[PDB]
Amino acid sequence: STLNPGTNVAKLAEQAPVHWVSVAQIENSLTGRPPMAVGFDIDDTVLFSSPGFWRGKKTYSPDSDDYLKNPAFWEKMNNGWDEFSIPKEAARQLIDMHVRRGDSIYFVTGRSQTKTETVSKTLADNFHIPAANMNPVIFAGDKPEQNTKVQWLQEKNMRIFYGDSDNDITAARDCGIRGIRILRAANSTYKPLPQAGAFGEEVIVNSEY
Amino acid sequence: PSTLNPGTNVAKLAEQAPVHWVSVAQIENSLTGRPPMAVGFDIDDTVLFSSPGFWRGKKTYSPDSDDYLKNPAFWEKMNNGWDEFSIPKEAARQLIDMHVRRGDSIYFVTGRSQTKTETVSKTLADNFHIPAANMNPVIFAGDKPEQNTKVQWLQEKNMRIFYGDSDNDITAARDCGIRGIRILRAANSTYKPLPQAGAFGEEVIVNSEY
Amino acid sequence: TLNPGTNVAKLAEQAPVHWVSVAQIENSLTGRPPMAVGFDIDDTVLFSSPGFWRGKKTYSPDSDDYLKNPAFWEKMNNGWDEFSIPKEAARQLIDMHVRRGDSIYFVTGRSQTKTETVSKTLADNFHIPAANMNPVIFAGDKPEQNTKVQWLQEKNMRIFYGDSDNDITAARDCGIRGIRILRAANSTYKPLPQAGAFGEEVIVNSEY
Amino acid sequence: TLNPGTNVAKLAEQAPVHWVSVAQIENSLTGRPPMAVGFDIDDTVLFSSPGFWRGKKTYSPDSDDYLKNPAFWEKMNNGWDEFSIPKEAARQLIDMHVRRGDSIYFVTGRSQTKTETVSKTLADNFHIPAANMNPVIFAGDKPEQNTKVQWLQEKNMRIFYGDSDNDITAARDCGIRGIRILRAANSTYKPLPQAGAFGEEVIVNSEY
Ligand SMILES: [Mg+2]
Ligand SMILES: [Mg+2]
Ligand SMILES: [Mg+2]
Ligand SMILES: [Mg+2]
């Protein structure tokens, strides 16, 4: 645009009409409630997994997103490339809180399903989730050999679902449960960034890292 | 405060307070289907930037303190002409227009002291073009210590929503079990310190400082 | 759309502006002998919108002709600034220059009037010693008055503070240091200017 | 407290930092013939935390001792950068300098290894022309190496870009222009530094 655009105080103080919440406010809203099932999307919600997707694109589809359909990519991505995935501090705070409550934690992902996967171990180890609260990662999809995200949220009776994408939030709305938005990091390779708060949902402050 | 070059970082730049921000459009949308009702507005730093008169009052009657706020002579001047210097807030214009469209009955409940005569009601009706059908003379609730003077009025007029910039405006609404919505107090207001909007978990209107 | 939402890139986005604090300005002048510095008045040291607002409502509700009404200026320059709110940023800047022993000048584009109490209101609100205080200078295109630029050169002002683009370009035209002050969002003089539009230094939190 | 709230003075508060854009940096170089410029690597041109994270988890999960493990560096310098994400801000800067015909140098504090594929990774991801590309320089305190300052002086670099305080001080010690890049909030190298702590220029939106 212009070389020296400058700014003004109206612009400096301008706020988007979003419902921001803190982990502490979420915990307070659960006070007294017995243990329950809660779910988390994985990519850009609990793990900054762009390193692996970046390498996959470079290796299998330098000019496009065809790698997301390449079975070879998914073998690598679900069996070791998450050793390069950086866990999010906001996720750590949320999981620690749910673990203290004794809730059952589920991870639901849209990644393609492979015969073997080490993602579940990576998550339990990185977030130090006790055996009683941990559950194997759930790969949701269209395949007749699997169920959709909405179906899993309902089957496990999850009461809250955390995610960074719009479809994570609409899935929760469709099931009539509490959908909470996590901010996607600016350096994620999954762009454009989504508009957090676009459905009037609660958005966790400072959740980009 | 004592650091010449404090610098900054991106975590700090993107840092957000956990506040429930709302827009006039969202408020309006949340009222769809609701029949006409009574709604209330605080005046100072809510619909009018009235600091000019309070500043002149302080300098005239009590340069070193806030005793002017208890001075009958100050209120006479403030309520009968000094608001000619008070600047209407744009955020208030938008809210008032919206409520007029809904056909709601509008009330102004202020902590200013009541005087024999007052020209504030007319100043408000004129500046915000409020039709006679929606207007109501300003209610001067006064301000007593250890007590919230506004509660009585919100109850008796059956106000369903109350807009205000001070904590006592929000707690008044909470005491009545109605919807209290916060308006940001301008940074150049002489009424300091600025309150912490959202301190009761209430809705706060974006960009409402002007 | 009722819910536009936002994202972290937008939340952390910064305009390329050269921000400075009063402390940094003071530090940049260490060891320098007392000099002459000037300040714009409206929205720089005083939030005078109250008087201009009343003036417009009184003399030209539908336009800005009140700015041409000598009746308005008589009121504005002789008492309506008692309703003007001094700016904290200006207070800090003025105190700093007084401590340095600098010579303070106020240059305004307000219309000149036979008498004025503005100089008094300024010296009183900012506690400016007589030694550093100078009567307000009214500039303009009249034959009996010099323009803003000419006044900066004549007094050899080395720094000029202002909220408007013309305050900064005047400084630029004289080869001196022009420093921008933010105009408050509730000022009636709209639209707000783009502080930093000339690559100049802008004082932080100077909207109040 | 549970509901701390906020106020407009806090919402508009700005730190006194000298922000600049890539366009402004380019403008400031108008007319200057080709020159040498240098870039720090980690968190400046590459978000390399993925490799540093895996190394930490592998060699010293509870400390930074992995930074002195030869086994770590062998893997980090010979392939783990295939997981490093190039920064958009660096891409723009590099494209701008390549267009000017400047010589681009990359100086790193990473431990030197017998071989390295970092140079190849950089040249490929940023499409740097052979005429502007130079092999990565590993600076350090070892007797076989030269310090960062000596390298900047040796190659006569006029500008040095970096995210850490030591990148800026190196430029300051050489009398050249040191420009700060923002370190991403999700970098594993914490705490984040205070960009602008030396009054240096900081590039806007350079965290990605
Ligand atoms: Mg995701
Ligand atoms: Mg009020
Ligand atoms: Mg001005
Ligand atoms: Mg670095």
Distance of CA D62 from the midpoint of ligand 1 (Å): 28
Give the closest of A4, A13, A88 to D11, CB-based. A13
B111 is in an annotated binding site: yes
State how far residue A95 is from chain B, nearest Cα, in angstroms: 19
Whether CATH 3.40.50.11720 fits D1-208 = no
Intra-chain end-to-end CA distance of chain A, in Å: 30
Tell me which of C59, C66, C85 to substitute to probe the interface with B (most B C-beta atoms closer than 10 Å): C85
Intra-chain end-to-end CA distance of chain D, in Å: 33
Question: Could you tell me the CA-to-CA distances from C184 to B106, C54, C196, C199, C207 in Å, in that order?
Answer: 29, 18, 15, 20, 5
Q: Which residues of D are annotated as a binding site for Mg(2+)?
A: 40, 42, 163
**How far is residue A86's CA from residue D47's CA, in Å, rounded to a whole number?**
12
Instruction: Specify the 3-state DSSP secondary structure of D112.
Output: coil
Q: For residue D137, give every residue at least 6 positions away whose Cβ sits within 8 Å of its Cβ, in sequence order, or none.
A: D105, D106, D107, D108, D151
Question: Could you tell me the CA-to-CA distances from D84 to D113, D118, D128, D130 in Å, in that order?
Answer: 18, 10, 17, 22
What is the pairing mode between strands D85-86 and C85-86? Answer: unpaired
- Resolution of this model in Å is 2.0
Q: Which residues of A touch C16 (CB under 8 A)?
A: 4-5
Q: Is D40 a catalytic residue?
A: yes
Tell me which residues of chain B have a C-beta less than 8 Å from any C-beta of chain A: 11, 14-23, 26, 201, 206-207, 209-210
Chain C residue nearest residue B16, CA to CA: C11
A125 is in an annotated binding site: no
- The DSSP code sequence of chain A is --SS--B-HHHHH-----EEE-HHHHHHHHTTPPP-EEEEE-BTTTEE-HHHHHHHHHHH-TTSSGGGG-HHHHHHHHTTGGGGPEEPHHHHHHHHHHHHHTPEEEEEE-SPP-S---HHHHHHHHTT--TTT----EE--SSTTS--HHHHHHHTTEEEEEESSHHHHHHHHHTTSEEEE-PPPTT-SS-SPP-BTTTS-EEETTTT-
Check CB contact under 8 Å for C9 and D204. no
Task: Write down the catalytic residue from C42, C43, C81, C167.
Answer: C42
**How far is residue C195's CA from residue D175's CA, in Å, rounded to a whole number?**
31
Tell me which residues of chain A have a C-beta less than 8 Å from any C-beta of chain C: 4-11, 13, 16-18, 183-186, 193-200, 208
Distance of CA B42 from the midpoint of ligand 2 (Å): 6
Q: Of B45, B90, B85, B60, whose CA–CA distance to C51 is shortest?
A: B85
By the CB criterion, residues less than 5 angstroms from ion ligand 1 are A 41, 43-45, 164-165
What is the pairing mode between strands D137-138 and D103-108? Answer: parallel
Instruction: Specify the 3-state DSSP secondary structure of C167.
Output: helix
φ/ψ bin of C23: left (φ > 0), alpha (ψ from -120 to 50), beta (otherwise)? alpha
Q: Point out the ligand nearest to the CA of residue D189.
A: 4
Identify the helix (H) or strand (E) that includes residue C120.
helix C118-125
Q: For residue C199, give every residue at least 6 positions away whose Cβ sits within 8 Å of its Cβ, in sequence order, or none.
A: A4, C18, D24
Give the closest of A13, A20, A200 to B19, CB-based. A20
In this structure, what token pair is assigned to residue C35? 């000099």
In this structure, what token pair is assigned to residue A135? 């559950």
A166 near A199, Cβ under 8 Å?
A: yes
What experimental approach yielded this model? X-ray
Distance of CA A9 from the midpoint of ligand 1 (Å): 35
Check CB contact under 8 Å for D3 and B201. yes
A65 is in an annotated binding site: no
Q: Helix crossing, A89-101 with A23-30: angle to 10°?
A: 20
Torsion of CA C116, C122, C124, C126, to 10 degrees: 180
Check CB contact under 8 Å for C8 and A183. yes
**How far is residue A11's CA from residue A7's CA, in Å, rounded to a whole number?**
7
Instruction: Specify the 3-state DSSP secondary structure of C123.
Output: helix
- Hunting for tokens 């212009």 — which residue is that? A2
**How far is residue A48's CA from residue C151's CA, in Å, rounded to a whole number?**
60
**Which letter, b or e, does each residue of B169-205 get, where b requires 16 or more Cβ atoms within 10 Å of its Cβ?**
bbbbbeebebbbbbbbbbbbbbbeebbbbbbebbbbb
Distance of CA D43 from the midpoint of ligand 1 (Å): 24
**How far is residue D207's CA from residue D49's CA, in Å, rounded to a whole number?**
13
Which amino acid belongs to residue A117?
E
Angle at C95 between CA C169 and CA C206, to 5 degrees: 50
Q: Which residues of C touch A197 (CB under 8 A)?
A: 3-6
Instruction: Specify the 3-state DSSP secondary structure of C37.
Output: strand
φ/ψ bin of C19: left (φ > 0), alpha (ψ from -120 to 50), beta (otherwise)? beta
* Whole-angstrom Cα Rg for chain D: 18
Q: For residue A121, give every residue at least 6 positions away whose Cβ sits within 8 Å of its Cβ, in sequence order, or none.
A: none
**How far is residue B7's CA from residue B5's CA, in Å, rounded to a whole number?**
6
Whether CATH 3.30.750.80 fits A1-209 = no
Whether CATH 3.40.50.1000 fits B1-210 = yes
Distance of CA D48 from the midpoint of ligand 3 (Å): 49
CA B146, distance to chain mean position in Å, is 20
Phi, psi of B158 (to 5 degrees): 50, 50
Adjacent-strand bridge partners of C62: none
Distance of CA B101 from the midpoint of ligand 2 (Å): 24
Tell me which of B23, B47, B85 to substitute to probe the interface with C (most C C-beta atoms closer than 10 Å): B85
A171 near A149, Cβ under 8 Å?
A: yes
D168-174 long-range Cβ contacts below 8 angstroms, 24+ apart:
D168/D197, D168/D198, D168/D200, D169/D198, D172/D198, D173/D149, D174/D149
Tell me which of B21, B87, B89, B93 to substitute to probe the interface with C (most C C-beta atoms closer than 10 Å): B87
Phi, psi of D206 (to 5 degrees): -90, 15
D16 near C19, Cβ under 8 Å?
A: yes
In this structure, chain D runs to a length of 208
A38 near A152, Cβ under 8 Å?
A: no
Q: Which residues of A touch C199 (CB under 8 A)?
A: 4
Q: Of A29, A160, A48, D197, whose CA–CA distance to C8 is shortest?
A: A48
Check CB contact under 8 Å for D192 and B19. no
**Hey, which chains touch B, using 3+ CB pairs under 8 Å?**
A, C, D
Which residue stretches of chain D are H helix?
8-12, 22-28, 49-59, 70-76, 88-100, 118-125, 148-154, 165-174
In this structure, what token pair is assigned to residue A99? 């673990």
A149 is in an annotated binding site: yes
**How far is residue B168's CA from residue A80's CA, in Å, rounded to a whole number?**
57
Chain D residue nearest residue C21, CA to CA: D16
What is the pairing mode between strands A86-87 and A47-48? Answer: antiparallel
Angle at D50 between CA D44 and CA D56, to 5 degrees: 110
**Hey, which chains touch C, using 3+ CB pairs under 8 Å?**
A, B, D
Check CB contact under 8 Å for B21 and A16. yes
Distance of CA A182 from the midpoint of ligand 1 (Å): 9
Check CB contact under 8 Å for B10 and D193. no
